[PDB]
XYZ file of C-alpha atoms in Angstrom:
693
model
C 30.930 5.824 0.211
C 29.748 3.643 2.984
C 27.191 0.786 2.976
C 23.646 1.432 4.284
C 22.728 -1.064 7.005
C 19.221 -1.643 8.503
C 19.602 -1.722 12.295
C 15.947 -1.887 13.205
C 12.716 -3.210 11.697
C 9.492 -2.001 13.051
C 6.361 -3.994 11.901
C 3.235 -1.865 11.510
C -0.332 -2.196 10.682
C -3.408 0.141 10.367
C -5.137 1.504 13.408
C -8.181 3.563 12.821
C -8.503 6.190 15.586
C -11.306 8.881 16.233
C -8.561 11.314 17.523
C -4.798 11.424 17.092
C -3.881 14.350 19.126
C -2.138 12.146 21.894
C 0.056 10.607 19.179
C 1.536 14.145 17.895
C 5.333 14.832 17.848
C 5.799 18.079 19.767
C 9.447 18.899 20.971
C 9.733 21.321 23.840
C 5.998 21.220 24.672
C 3.785 20.557 27.901
C 0.009 20.232 28.509
C -9.992 17.599 18.079
C -7.887 16.198 15.220
C -10.440 14.158 13.208
C -10.087 10.445 12.272
C -7.091 8.879 10.701
C -5.946 5.589 9.577
C -3.085 5.538 12.001
C -0.054 3.074 12.047
C 0.530 0.967 15.149
C 4.024 -0.613 15.817
C 3.273 -4.290 16.069
C 6.901 -5.422 16.911
C 10.343 -4.136 16.964
C 13.150 -6.330 15.829
C 16.758 -5.113 16.226
C 19.379 -6.447 13.693
C 22.079 -8.403 15.033
C 24.653 -7.034 12.562
C 28.145 -8.417 13.296
C 30.723 -6.013 14.215
C 32.358 -6.912 10.896
C 29.533 -2.688 10.426
C 33.251 -2.065 10.121
C 33.046 -3.557 6.603
C 29.990 -1.530 5.645
C 31.530 1.586 7.027
C 34.256 0.283 4.793
C 31.900 -1.580 2.146
C 29.847 -4.879 1.838
C 30.712 -8.358 3.556
C 31.023 -11.906 3.290
C 28.768 -14.384 1.349
C 25.570 -12.228 2.102
C 22.502 -14.097 0.847
C 20.390 -11.777 -1.734
C 16.901 -11.224 -0.484
C 13.866 -10.138 -2.622
C 12.422 -6.872 -1.174
C 8.947 -8.250 -0.530
C 10.355 -10.825 1.916
C 9.501 -8.668 4.905
C 6.615 -7.800 7.261
C 5.028 -4.559 6.403
C 7.432 -2.368 8.041
C 9.623 0.646 8.851
C 13.485 -0.047 8.316
C 15.584 2.174 10.353
C 18.918 2.547 8.468
C 22.541 3.620 9.302
C 25.050 4.670 6.563
C 28.094 5.982 7.993
C 27.525 8.956 10.289
C 23.893 9.266 8.781
C 20.521 7.657 9.585
C 17.282 7.448 7.800
C 14.401 5.220 6.972
C 13.077 2.905 4.444
C 9.587 1.381 4.138
C 8.077 -1.716 2.493
C 5.337 -1.549 -0.103
C 3.945 -3.828 -2.823
C 6.932 -3.120 -5.050
C 9.483 -3.935 -2.500
C 11.071 -1.217 -0.438
C 11.609 2.614 -1.031
C 14.040 5.054 0.594
C 15.809 8.256 -0.608
C 19.224 8.670 -2.229
C 20.678 10.884 0.335
C 20.153 8.070 2.874
C 21.226 4.978 0.949
C 23.382 6.706 -1.951
C 21.550 4.024 -4.312
C 23.593 1.154 -2.649
C 22.482 -2.218 -1.674
C 21.106 -2.696 1.873
C 22.756 -5.088 4.534
C 20.036 -6.728 6.574
C 21.021 -9.030 9.399
C 17.643 -10.379 10.011
C 16.182 -13.480 11.983
C 17.000 -14.792 8.316
C 20.913 -14.269 8.532
C 23.086 -11.931 6.734
C 21.079 -10.655 3.721
C 21.286 -8.138 1.084
C 18.590 -6.193 -0.903
C 19.601 -4.802 -4.169
C 18.906 -1.278 -5.167
C 17.266 -1.543 -8.587
C 17.011 2.295 -9.400
C 18.324 5.663 -8.040
C 17.747 8.976 -8.874
C 19.894 11.487 -7.174
C 17.956 14.423 -8.415
C 14.519 13.466 -7.071
C 16.292 11.745 -4.243
C 14.567 8.444 -4.601
C 16.211 4.789 -4.323
C 14.008 1.861 -5.317
C 14.571 -1.705 -3.810
C 11.984 -3.076 -6.187
C 9.692 -0.886 -8.221
C 8.039 2.493 -7.059
C 4.176 2.255 -6.058
C 3.632 5.524 -4.108
C 0.034 6.772 -4.693
C -1.080 10.253 -5.887
C -2.110 12.619 -3.136
C -5.133 14.898 -3.596
C -4.593 18.714 -3.217
C -5.682 19.499 0.219
C -5.433 16.087 1.885
C -4.663 15.782 5.282
C -1.665 13.257 5.753
C 1.236 12.534 8.309
C 4.459 11.054 8.731
C 4.890 8.388 11.535
C 8.324 7.905 13.279
C 8.316 4.780 15.339
C 11.059 5.814 17.329
C 10.079 9.470 17.970
C 8.277 10.243 21.185
C 4.804 11.888 21.147
C 3.391 14.656 23.551
C 2.078 11.576 25.662
C 5.436 10.374 26.620
C 5.021 7.208 24.588
C 7.081 6.407 21.375
C 5.823 6.584 18.123
C 5.009 9.964 16.961
C 2.981 11.597 14.086
C 3.909 14.764 12.351
C 0.602 15.873 10.803
C 0.667 17.505 7.237
C -1.722 19.183 4.621
C -1.005 18.860 0.871
C -0.541 22.413 -0.305
C 0.400 22.238 -3.779
C 3.938 21.192 -4.370
C 4.828 20.402 -0.713
C 3.207 19.583 2.540
C 2.585 22.076 5.181
C 3.380 20.896 8.761
C 0.146 21.314 10.879
C -0.957 20.549 14.560
C -3.393 17.454 14.793
C -6.067 20.134 14.564
C -4.811 21.665 11.432
C -3.350 25.000 12.615
C 0.243 25.684 11.194
C 3.240 23.949 12.920
C 6.718 24.817 13.341
C 9.680 22.204 13.718
C 13.346 22.871 13.954
C 14.957 21.065 11.180
C 17.264 19.585 13.663
C 14.267 17.886 15.317
C 13.410 16.190 11.850
C 16.807 14.979 11.162
C 16.932 11.385 10.596
C 13.352 11.272 9.543
C 14.145 11.201 5.648
C 12.899 7.989 3.894
C 9.890 7.712 6.163
C 6.749 7.164 3.989
C 4.138 9.967 3.985
C 0.525 8.454 4.559
C -2.897 10.124 3.472
C -4.842 10.174 6.679
C -8.252 8.978 5.316
C -6.746 5.851 3.748
C -3.253 5.035 5.075
C -1.869 4.795 1.728
C 1.625 5.839 1.049
C 1.513 9.039 -0.958
C 5.143 10.088 -0.913
C 8.401 10.087 1.390
C 10.207 12.574 3.416
C 13.319 14.030 1.649
C 13.516 17.941 2.334
C 12.452 20.024 5.182
C 12.128 23.830 4.719
C 11.683 26.744 7.221
C 10.982 30.253 6.195
C 10.439 33.274 8.375
C 7.203 33.246 9.910
C 5.671 30.301 8.090
C 5.026 26.840 9.025
C 7.591 24.084 8.333
C 7.256 22.541 4.924
C 8.170 18.867 3.820
C 9.001 18.733 0.252
C 8.882 15.292 -1.429
C 8.997 16.554 -5.129
C 6.227 16.106 -7.710
C 4.855 13.309 -9.821
C 5.581 13.881 -13.556
C 2.776 13.095 -16.062
C -3.105 10.352 -33.820
C -6.750 11.230 -33.410
C -5.996 13.078 -30.533
C -6.397 16.693 -32.092
C -10.067 16.330 -30.913
C -9.079 16.541 -27.048
C -6.889 19.590 -27.984
C -9.870 21.282 -29.503
C -12.279 20.923 -26.688
C -9.986 23.066 -24.363
C -11.029 25.976 -22.473
C -8.756 28.727 -21.467
C -7.142 27.810 -18.353
C -6.410 24.268 -19.149
C -3.127 22.397 -20.031
C -2.584 19.107 -21.879
C 1.036 17.359 -22.597
C 1.571 15.469 -25.728
C 3.975 12.573 -26.420
C 4.392 12.073 -30.225
C 6.566 9.948 -32.490
C 9.804 11.352 -33.981
C 8.239 11.618 -37.204
C 4.391 12.411 -36.769
C 5.487 16.082 -37.278
C 4.064 17.250 -33.950
C 5.155 20.703 -34.897
C 3.616 20.451 -38.344
C 0.240 18.526 -38.875
C -0.799 18.854 -35.204
C -0.945 22.554 -35.057
C -2.157 22.654 -38.617
C -4.996 20.197 -37.897
C -5.829 22.122 -34.949
C -6.024 25.692 -36.888
C -8.107 23.737 -39.309
C -10.899 22.469 -36.956
C -10.891 25.833 -35.114
C -10.567 28.032 -38.126
C -7.645 29.239 -40.227
C -8.649 32.828 -39.217
C -7.755 32.252 -35.459
C -4.191 32.627 -34.071
C -2.217 29.570 -32.856
C 1.237 30.044 -31.262
C 3.974 27.484 -31.633
C 7.234 27.877 -29.631
C 10.445 26.201 -30.569
C 13.903 26.417 -28.666
C 16.444 27.511 -31.664
C 15.685 30.306 -34.263
C 16.805 28.065 -37.045
C 14.247 25.294 -36.429
C 11.506 27.687 -36.074
C 12.340 29.373 -39.338
C 12.897 26.034 -41.191
C 9.482 24.647 -39.880
C 7.982 28.098 -40.951
C 8.943 27.598 -44.639
C 8.429 23.840 -44.895
C 4.583 24.576 -43.795
C 4.373 27.955 -45.562
C 4.779 25.876 -48.892
C 3.047 22.664 -48.275
C -0.158 24.335 -46.860
C -0.867 27.278 -49.100
C -4.508 27.676 -47.682
C -3.102 28.660 -44.170
C -1.439 31.907 -43.277
C 1.920 31.536 -41.460
C 4.023 34.152 -39.419
C 7.487 33.772 -37.851
C 8.839 35.630 -34.904
C 12.829 35.440 -34.265
C 13.648 39.055 -34.513
C 12.788 42.344 -33.278
C 9.749 42.538 -30.942
C 7.049 43.429 -33.646
C 5.013 45.801 -31.703
C 1.160 45.314 -31.705
C 0.948 41.995 -33.400
C -2.354 40.132 -34.327
C -1.356 38.378 -37.445
C -3.783 35.567 -38.389
C -2.755 31.671 -38.865
C 0.038 29.906 -37.258
C 3.014 31.714 -35.683
C 6.249 29.912 -35.292
C 8.368 31.624 -32.810
C 11.307 31.104 -30.432
C 10.910 31.453 -26.870
C 13.700 33.890 -26.812
C 11.380 36.239 -28.966
C 9.048 36.610 -26.151
C 11.736 37.005 -23.316
C 12.324 40.521 -24.818
C 8.943 41.493 -23.667
C 8.121 42.992 -20.069
C 5.434 40.831 -18.424
C 2.237 42.968 -19.235
C 3.280 43.155 -22.920
C 3.814 39.374 -22.873
C 0.555 38.629 -21.268
C -1.196 41.139 -23.519
C 0.622 39.383 -26.598
C -0.128 35.896 -25.135
C -3.697 36.156 -24.420
C -4.353 37.009 -28.092
C -3.660 33.507 -29.250
C -6.358 30.630 -29.213
C -3.562 28.105 -28.666
C -0.021 28.064 -27.446
C 2.120 24.856 -28.264
C 5.397 24.346 -26.329
C 7.568 22.131 -28.547
C 10.537 20.303 -27.328
C 10.048 21.213 -23.692
C 12.308 18.311 -22.696
C 15.185 20.707 -23.687
C 14.501 23.108 -20.684
C 16.457 25.919 -22.208
C 16.734 29.222 -19.925
C 14.296 31.174 -22.512
C 11.843 27.932 -22.212
C 11.845 27.928 -18.469
C 11.486 31.711 -18.112
C 8.538 31.557 -20.690
C 6.903 28.697 -19.122
C 7.215 30.249 -15.706
C 6.023 33.817 -17.033
C 3.015 32.746 -18.891
C 1.823 30.434 -16.128
C 1.340 33.497 -13.849
C -1.746 34.236 -15.955
C -2.518 30.571 -17.305
C -6.188 30.785 -16.657
C -6.501 32.831 -19.988
C -4.600 30.421 -22.095
C -4.917 26.912 -23.750
C -1.402 25.408 -23.461
C -0.158 22.197 -25.021
C 3.318 20.887 -24.324
C 4.863 18.403 -26.695
C 7.904 16.262 -27.067
C 16.676 -2.717 -38.260
C 18.927 -4.348 -35.496
C 21.608 -2.490 -33.607
C 24.289 -4.855 -32.364
C 25.248 -3.156 -28.855
C 28.662 -3.763 -27.067
C 30.416 -2.310 -24.030
C 33.916 -1.119 -24.898
C 36.353 -1.223 -22.103
C 38.260 1.697 -20.720
C 41.732 2.143 -22.577
C 44.749 2.341 -20.048
C 45.559 5.540 -21.798
C 49.016 5.460 -23.452
C 49.098 1.624 -23.005
C 49.181 -0.747 -25.887
C 46.244 -2.482 -27.038
C 47.199 -4.585 -29.897
C 47.055 -4.489 -33.511
C 43.280 -5.250 -33.892
C 42.029 -2.664 -31.421
C 42.594 1.146 -31.220
C 41.734 3.727 -28.735
C 38.661 5.649 -29.730
C 37.745 8.524 -27.269
C 39.348 6.339 -24.592
C 37.602 3.156 -25.567
C 38.965 -0.240 -26.889
C 37.153 -0.618 -30.211
C 38.034 -3.288 -32.926
C 40.140 -2.011 -35.742
C 37.596 -3.635 -37.998
C 34.938 -0.995 -37.399
C 37.311 1.746 -38.722
C 36.210 -0.035 -42.409
C 32.940 1.432 -41.745
C 31.150 4.921 -41.182
C 31.600 6.043 -37.735
C 29.961 8.487 -35.290
C 31.939 9.037 -31.969
C 29.963 10.742 -29.154
C 32.693 12.758 -26.992
C 31.829 15.040 -23.946
C 33.977 18.224 -24.983
C 35.101 20.330 -27.939
C 38.822 19.174 -26.939
C 38.226 15.566 -26.994
C 36.353 16.114 -30.256
C 39.152 17.768 -31.835
C 42.014 15.711 -30.386
C 40.215 12.584 -31.396
C 39.687 13.587 -34.917
C 43.256 14.709 -35.264
C 45.014 11.529 -34.054
C 42.845 9.515 -36.225
C 44.065 11.572 -39.263
C 47.669 11.230 -38.074
C 47.139 7.503 -37.998
C 45.636 7.875 -41.510
C 42.039 7.755 -41.286
C 39.470 10.160 -42.765
C 38.270 11.741 -39.639
C 36.466 15.097 -38.929
C 34.890 16.970 -36.007
C 31.778 18.682 -34.953
C 30.879 20.769 -31.783
C 28.681 23.798 -30.878
C 28.928 26.823 -33.069
C 30.705 24.812 -35.778
C 29.027 25.041 -39.363
C 27.445 21.714 -40.184
C 28.439 22.030 -43.891
C 32.125 21.390 -42.821
C 31.613 17.760 -42.546
C 30.677 17.265 -46.233
C 34.183 16.865 -47.007
C 34.675 14.148 -44.472
C 31.476 12.152 -45.285
C 31.805 12.170 -48.905
C 34.768 9.666 -48.666
C 34.045 6.394 -46.992
C 34.965 4.773 -44.513
C 34.547 8.258 -42.674
C 34.690 8.868 -38.833
C 32.916 11.928 -37.259
C 33.728 12.819 -33.815
C 31.204 14.889 -32.148
C 29.589 16.545 -28.861
C 26.123 16.639 -28.056
C 25.830 19.458 -30.332
C 25.316 17.397 -33.296
C 21.885 16.531 -32.307
C 20.494 18.752 -37.119
C 23.249 17.121 -39.187
C 23.270 14.552 -41.749
C 25.721 11.484 -41.508
C 25.055 9.408 -44.687
C 25.432 5.519 -44.558
C 26.066 5.715 -40.873
C 27.075 2.333 -39.644
C 28.447 2.243 -36.098
C 28.254 4.541 -33.115
C 31.082 4.862 -30.370
C 29.525 6.554 -27.302
C 31.754 7.674 -24.278
C 28.310 7.903 -22.404
C 29.370 11.495 -21.410
C 28.472 15.215 -22.022
C 29.909 18.400 -20.892
C 27.530 21.004 -19.408
C 27.652 23.934 -16.886
C 26.456 22.833 -13.448
C 26.070 24.762 -10.305
C 26.730 24.100 -6.735
C 24.789 26.160 -3.814
C 26.123 27.171 -0.453
C 25.277 29.037 2.751
C 28.750 30.292 2.512
C 29.593 32.850 -0.052
C 29.990 32.736 -2.790
C 26.277 31.043 -2.456
C 26.359 30.306 -6.248
C 29.571 28.637 -8.136
C 29.189 27.655 -11.719
C 31.243 25.709 -14.097
C 31.501 23.055 -17.009
C 31.552 19.460 -15.668
C 31.657 16.127 -17.346
C 28.579 14.158 -16.641
C 26.880 10.846 -17.762
C 24.062 11.721 -20.585
C 20.424 10.983 -19.752
C 18.660 7.861 -20.631
C 17.019 9.840 -23.492
C 20.272 11.461 -24.733
C 21.864 7.899 -24.704
C 18.777 6.696 -26.738
C 19.239 9.572 -29.454
C 22.906 8.619 -29.582
C 22.312 5.017 -30.059
C 19.413 5.909 -32.542
C 21.830 7.479 -35.121
C 22.154 4.109 -36.551
C 19.941 1.036 -37.454
C 18.003 3.564 -39.631
C 18.227 2.406 -42.984
C 20.571 -0.461 -42.637
C 21.608 -2.378 -39.319
C 23.959 -0.690 -36.955
C 26.496 -1.468 -34.285
C 26.860 0.583 -31.127
C 29.832 0.668 -28.672
C 29.582 2.336 -25.341
C 31.266 2.743 -22.286
C 29.998 1.233 -19.069
C 29.109 4.701 -17.754
C 25.594 4.691 -16.509
C 22.859 7.264 -17.809
C 21.028 9.109 -15.400
C 17.178 9.538 -15.271
C 16.334 13.220 -15.757
C 17.877 16.210 -17.475
C 19.404 18.517 -14.892
C 18.014 22.156 -15.771
C 19.063 24.001 -12.729
C 21.820 25.803 -14.408
C 19.635 26.803 -17.276
C 16.923 27.732 -14.665
C 19.515 29.893 -12.835
C 20.172 31.800 -16.199
C 16.437 31.975 -16.877
C 16.091 34.178 -13.635
C 17.550 36.970 -15.872
C 14.128 37.277 -17.634
C 12.411 38.283 -14.493
C 14.752 40.990 -13.271
C 12.881 43.502 -15.201
C 9.359 42.688 -13.783
C 10.714 41.651 -10.396
C 9.229 38.186 -10.773
C 11.011 35.365 -9.186
C 11.520 33.001 -12.178
C 12.533 30.032 -9.818
C 9.260 30.206 -8.134
C 6.961 30.700 -11.097
C 8.713 27.774 -12.312
C 8.087 25.582 -9.390
C 4.411 26.389 -9.270
C 4.192 26.033 -12.950
C 5.852 22.505 -12.628
C 3.366 21.404 -10.034
C 0.518 22.427 -12.137
C 1.707 20.835 -15.497
C 3.935 17.965 -14.036
C 6.606 18.214 -16.733
C 9.969 18.056 -15.013
C 11.503 16.283 -12.010
C 12.366 18.364 -9.014
C 15.430 18.507 -7.028
C 13.583 19.829 -3.938
C 16.786 20.872 -2.138
C 18.261 22.502 -4.975
C 15.011 24.219 -6.221
C 14.452 25.602 -2.950
C 18.067 26.895 -2.490
C 17.631 28.658 -5.999
C 14.375 30.178 -5.009
C 15.733 31.830 -2.078
C 18.614 33.302 -3.973
C 16.113 34.293 -6.505
C 14.591 36.382 -3.865
C 17.815 38.126 -3.200
C 18.231 38.837 -6.811
C 14.774 40.492 -6.954
C 14.631 42.292 -3.544
C 15.948 45.620 -4.983
C 15.560 46.789 -8.435
C 18.664 46.372 -10.701
C 20.770 49.715 -11.180
C 19.929 50.651 -14.683
C 23.667 50.735 -15.601
C 24.027 47.268 -14.683
C 20.958 46.329 -16.762
C 22.653 47.964 -19.586
C 26.177 46.601 -19.122
C 24.482 43.196 -19.094
C 22.702 43.589 -22.335
C 25.941 44.621 -24.144
C 28.442 42.450 -22.464
C 30.328 39.403 -24.057
C 30.617 38.059 -20.557
C 29.034 34.638 -20.786
C 27.007 34.784 -17.536
C 25.579 38.133 -17.201
C 23.336 37.259 -14.261
C 26.689 37.122 -12.384
C 26.817 40.846 -12.510
C 23.278 41.156 -11.233
C 23.966 39.000 -8.377
C 27.277 40.540 -7.407
C 25.686 44.053 -7.653
C 24.459 43.327 -4.103
C 27.857 43.174 -2.703
C 30.189 45.252 -5.205
C 30.017 47.208 -8.350
C 33.285 46.839 -9.484
C 33.697 43.513 -11.426
C 37.075 41.673 -11.092
C 39.436 39.978 -13.479
C 40.502 36.609 -12.211
C 43.669 34.955 -13.355
C 42.932 32.309 -15.809
C 43.312 28.606 -14.986
C 45.077 26.069 -17.434
C 45.501 22.443 -16.402
C 44.542 22.906 -12.732
C 47.053 25.645 -12.204
C 46.771 29.567 -11.798
C 48.130 31.201 -15.169
C 49.087 34.881 -15.608
C 46.730 35.329 -18.341
C 43.191 37.354 -17.946
C 39.980 36.771 -19.828
C 38.982 40.493 -20.364
C 35.300 41.233 -20.828
C 33.442 44.111 -22.602
C 32.445 47.007 -20.776
C 33.608 45.602 -17.146
C 36.113 48.087 -15.993
C 37.517 45.322 -13.865
C 40.528 44.990 -11.718
C 43.088 42.118 -11.370
C 42.181 39.949 -8.382
C 45.712 40.442 -7.111
C 45.636 40.300 -3.174
C 42.076 41.679 -2.711
C 39.352 38.981 -3.592
C 35.934 40.544 -4.137
C 32.594 39.647 -2.105
C 31.271 37.623 -4.900
C 27.866 36.343 -4.458
C 28.243 34.311 -7.734
C 31.433 32.830 -8.771
C 32.881 30.495 -11.470
C 34.549 27.250 -10.568
C 37.872 28.744 -12.026
C 37.341 31.839 -9.895
C 36.997 29.873 -6.774
C 39.866 27.565 -7.940
C 42.045 30.732 -8.489
C 41.141 31.901 -5.015
C 42.096 28.658 -3.433
C 45.436 28.029 -5.276
C 46.528 31.583 -4.231
C 45.878 30.897 -0.680
C 43.280 33.637 -0.560
C 39.835 33.509 1.170
C 36.514 34.591 -0.005
C 34.819 37.620 1.933
C 31.835 37.366 4.213
C 28.726 39.075 3.200
C 28.572 42.680 3.792
C 24.847 43.763 3.300
C 22.010 42.620 5.267
C 20.083 41.439 2.263
C 23.122 38.999 1.451
C 23.436 37.943 5.216
C 19.791 37.147 5.269
C 19.856 34.948 2.113
C 22.982 32.944 3.614
C 20.954 32.183 6.747
C 17.733 31.251 4.886
C 19.863 28.932 2.680
C 20.724 27.063 6.103
C 16.790 26.476 6.438
C 16.407 23.826 3.817
C 18.002 20.540 4.170
C 17.950 16.997 3.287
C 16.462 15.504 6.388
């Protein structure tokens, strides 16, 4: 809630040193580094902030002059935001910090320049970055010696201004002494360092910022700062050798799934084998017969069913990722290496089967060539409707948004977050007399042909609508919202809690929504003021993907995180990815009882991995009382083959629980048990060893 306040501004400048040993942070210590472009504090100014901090602790004050983020000395800015502290730093593009220090709110700076405010221009709570300006961090070469300099911390020579030395080791920084040997820091000793820049020692260039600190038994401390995401192009794909990767962005019409693999199997030879992976079985199948006809010269194969043992089919194979998740790892590798090329289509989707397959094949990637691919519209902001309040005779409530009734004479698509909103909106629009229909996941797309035949129509849909055909579409109304499973992770059992949550769509999702119109005629586009987020949050799907590693005892989360650093495809939540990795270790510490793996395979339970995780504490699944409208009912969602027990008085030691299960426990005044097995205790304690700093 609170407003971040700059309390101190430390001006700095480069300072070449032959040896930096005497500058190194070393809590609790007593009694050769190599050179570095060090940082020297040049001046310390303390902000004069008027105790009217109370506002800020409340929220922003007075008539505070806006200030461009360049109008500072090259400096490190000490920040206080409520009870939390952290840092920000100037660069060419302005000032950068991390979301968990600033919450993406404007800075209050009380300078030798008066009451000023610096505007947060972008914020990503997933990557933990906030930009007061535009990001300018350089890339870091693997292996580089780097450091973090804290102008307030005391070094081993009793002076203030201390360095934590680092070495870049893949997707993280390993803490080292000034002489390069591994170093341990209690995370409590690095608290308040987040937001500080990370400098490359040979240059002094900023190469990242401090976000997350991770300790792990008998290893050196690691700082995690995330990763940086990265026609006549078939030539570059054809030069590739096994062990190389290339990412492709292609237009929504260049048939990246069609001509690109076809051109490639052409230049290399129609006898070779190319693999193309697509998320949905339907999309793989459809493409496989649009290509099978139009290109008679080339053989075409399709894999969406049973495992097809010993397969060396020639030509282009279209397959679903799920087809290969059936395979144990040596079969998967054996099959995977027999392709010349592997195309990963629609990688932005980050489905569980996608994430597991990309993690799994990456463990042997040195034998593969992998390519990953992905009129005027008048826009308006519709205001939130008071909900049960009158709006007038020329506006109507559509999905909680004030829309002028005149649009109802047009062909409308409404984007709604939930199943329920889609059904209820379509229904009140018929009861008020309009030609409405609805669509959500698992519905059959043919059922809209009776709505869309009769203009004006209005279709109300979730994100599930986007392969469907809305003829003569004029206007889109967009809540800005979607409804997906989300996870929250904790050091207290249950460590894992999942549940559906309404959330803002991504920038890319919002674009596809807006892009339903303006296609053959001009379009109109009404949207809420809800703000789209930067990255698709794939952690729930990554959680579910861990399943495909149980058989082979592979930590899917860690294989994914290493893959992602190599191929630079997804943004990283360093805190959450690390927490998921630790829990994934617990999942694969012992082999799953066969009866569990079977019950998982035949159950209608929607999160089978929940039984895998909970087997570490209990073998009897429990039936929790259902929730309806935030209250505990007396119904029970019984599940297949789970000889469960009613919760009643005895709440089970779940490692993994749903939101409704957790809500049920809380409403009943009950308590979740503490871990009973030493593997589960140890996971809980290792979860305490990653923190936003």
